[PDB]
Design an enzyme around this catalytic site. Structure first.
Site, PDB file in Angstrom:
ATOM      1  N   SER A 160       0.795  -1.238   0.000  1.00  0.00           N
ATOM      2  CA  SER A 160       0.000   0.000   0.000  1.00  0.00           C
ATOM      3  C   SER A 160       0.809   1.260   0.000  1.00  0.00           C
ATOM      4  CB  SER A 160      -0.999   0.065   1.181  1.00  0.00           C
ATOM      5  OG  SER A 160      -0.339   0.528   2.334  1.00  0.00           O
TER       6      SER A 160
ATOM      7  N   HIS B 179       1.585   5.520   4.238  1.00  0.00           N
ATOM      8  CA  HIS B 179       0.688   6.086   3.215  1.00  0.00           C
ATOM      9  C   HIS B 179       1.098   7.409   2.644  1.00  0.00           C
ATOM     10  CE1 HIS B 179      -2.911   3.565   4.866  1.00  0.00           C
ATOM     11  NE2 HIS B 179      -2.135   2.856   4.075  1.00  0.00           N
TER      12      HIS B 179
END
Length: 174
Positions: free
Chosen positions: A111, A156
Site C-alpha cells: 500500500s 501512506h
C-alpha cells in the site's frame, strides 16, 4: 494486449508470497522478508523491498492488487515498464523506511507503493494531461478517505509524497 509485464510479475510475486504465508504461517515468512529488526541483518538487502510482497489476508491482498493493477498498469501502458519499476523500488524502499520508524519492523503490504502510484498518476494527470495518465476525483476522494481512515485504524503519506515528488520532477517539462 492487456496489462504489461511489470504489472503481472508483481501480482504473481505477491500471490506466491501470500500462498507461502498460508502454508507456512505469517511468522515464518515475516522472519525472512520483513524489514531488518536487528542491525546485524542490515546486509540482507532483499528485506528493504520484500516487506511489500507480504499480505495478511485475502482482502488485504485483493484490495492492493486491484489498485496496483489499475494504477500500475496505467503507468506501464502510458509510460513503460522502466517507470513502474522505479516508482515501485523507490516507494517500497521509502515507505518501508518511514513505516519502520513509526511502528517497528513487523509490517508488510503493497500500500506504500499504491499510494505512490496514486499521488503520481493524479499529479502527472494534473500537471501534464499530455501523457494520457490521470486519476478521477472519485479515486482521489477514495485516496484521502483511505488516509484519514488509516489515522483511526477504521507508509501512506510517505508513499503519497514519493509519487507526488516523482510526478512533479517528471512534469517540469511544462
Amino acid at each position: 494486449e492487456r496489462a504489461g509485464p511489470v504489472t503481472w510479475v508483481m501480482m504473481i510475486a505477491c500471490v506466491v508470497v501470500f500462498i507461502a504465508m498460508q502454508i507456512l504461517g505469517d511468522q515464518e515468512v515475516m522472519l525472512w522478508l520483513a524489514w531488518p529488526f536487528d542491525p546485524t541483518l542490515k546486509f540482507e538487502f532483499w528485506r528493504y523491498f520484500t516487506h511489500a510482497l507480504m499480505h495478511f489476508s485475502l482482502m488485504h491482498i485483493l484490495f492492493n492488487l486491484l489498485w496496483w493493477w489499475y494504477l500500475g498498469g496505467a503507468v506501464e501502458k502510458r509510460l513503460g515498464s522502466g517507470k513502474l519499476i522505479v516508482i515501485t523500488l523507490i516507494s517500497a524502499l521509502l515507505s518501508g523506511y518511514v513505516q519502520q520508524k513509526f511502528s517497528g519492523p513487523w509490517f508488510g503490504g503493497l500500500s506504500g507503493v499504491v499510494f505512490a502510484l496514486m499521488g503520481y498518476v493524479w499529479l502527472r494527470g494534473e500537471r501534464d494531461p499530455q501523457s494520457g495518465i490521470y486519476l478521477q476525483r472519485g479515486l482521489i476522494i477514495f485516496a484521502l478517505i483511505w488516509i484519514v481512515a488509516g489515522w483511526f485504524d477504521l507508509a501512506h503519506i510517505a508513499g503519497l509524497a514519493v509519487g507526488l515528488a516523482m510526478a512533479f520532477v517528471d512534469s517540469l517539462n511544462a
